[PDB]
Amino acid sequence: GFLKLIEIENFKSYKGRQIIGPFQRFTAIIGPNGSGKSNLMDAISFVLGEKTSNLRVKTLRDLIHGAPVGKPAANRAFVSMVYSEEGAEDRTFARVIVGGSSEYKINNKVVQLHEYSEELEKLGILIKARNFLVFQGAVESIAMKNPKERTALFEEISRSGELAQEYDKRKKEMGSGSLVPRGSGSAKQAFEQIKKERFDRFNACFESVATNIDEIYKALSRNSSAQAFLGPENPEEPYLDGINYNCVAPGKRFRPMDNLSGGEKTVAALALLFAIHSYKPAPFFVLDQIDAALDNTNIGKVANYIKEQSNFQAIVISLKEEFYTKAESLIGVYPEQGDCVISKVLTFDLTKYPDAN
Amino acid sequence: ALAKTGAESISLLELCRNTNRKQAAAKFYSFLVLKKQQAIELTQEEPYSDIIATPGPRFHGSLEVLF
């Protein structure tokens, strides 16, 4: 499916009720500094289950327009996503601020957060893994993350992490933690069995991602000399240690990974993001200023990858015309004057013009 | 300088006639900047309809260039 549009009411700088979109398969959000692009990123995170602490506020009511200056514009606010799928009626997922707490709705019927998250997961939207959302200033961290933190992402997506607590308990019951562990009989078998279950869950995801990442990193690089390797530090128990990620940039010699440029790290991060998608597809990606460190060559290769794929939809926020002029439509954010800054949007179809001379 | 009169409104879609994608995008972005500067007011009837600029509450120079 895809994100047809977002409806926002009195959320941060988005005063009043506003339609954001409709989105095309590749849409860019643009606008001058201070207009409200980062608040729009927060609105998307909010409707997709983000916890209040990650939305730059102390309390939920502070998300209502006008609250940070003591002039809240309403006692309620909302963000809604209209999700569309061929052969199905549109489904609206909404998060409403009412009474200083969140109310979740699917097609205007109130649901609890557990059901909201479960229904989003069926569409490929994982509100804990959050593998579909890349925040401003974060794309490089995906490539340079701690190997152990990369393992944690795979344990969340694969659900192998659901077995970690029982794994740990059975490992100790087998004798781990004693000077000379003496595993035998039922206790050792119980550990071997949970170890196998965790291994199988982890590998069903990891082996898929690791076997698909090279072609994707090449396809991003648009060059057969680039190479990408994902490998466990602990092959027997990959979930126990780090996942190593090393690449060879296209037409370049091997460098560690940290000696790469910001742009090279960005491309490596995107290959991992899209390799995860090849195993568990998300309907859309929201990419906030991922082009910050990219030169023009890599901007073109990334945009072409999106366009020759848009099996997903891409919503990007960008400051760089070299990137945003490759989208099908633009959502332009502008500020209105008031006691607080108000954000509003315009929509513009670039496909009406030749991309040529 | 006095004889450089203008219109009551500017149509973004008319400005972008016979432009390429990069030029059209730049005119769209210019409307966002002019609005932030309060040099224009903006109206858009529906998503993806024409975007119409009228004079805003602050003066602005070189508007014959921007239009």
Ligand SMILES: Nc1ncnc2c1ncn2[C@@H]1O[C@H](COP(=O)(O)OP(=O)(O)O)[C@@H](O)[C@H]1O
């Ligand atoms: N709850 C709110 N009510 C009104 N304005 C808000 C609220 N939250 C944030 N803002 C305003 O939004 C503005 C920042 O917008 P921002 O998204 O950061 O701009 P951009 O990302 O395009 O550079 C700030 O002036 C900030 O005070």
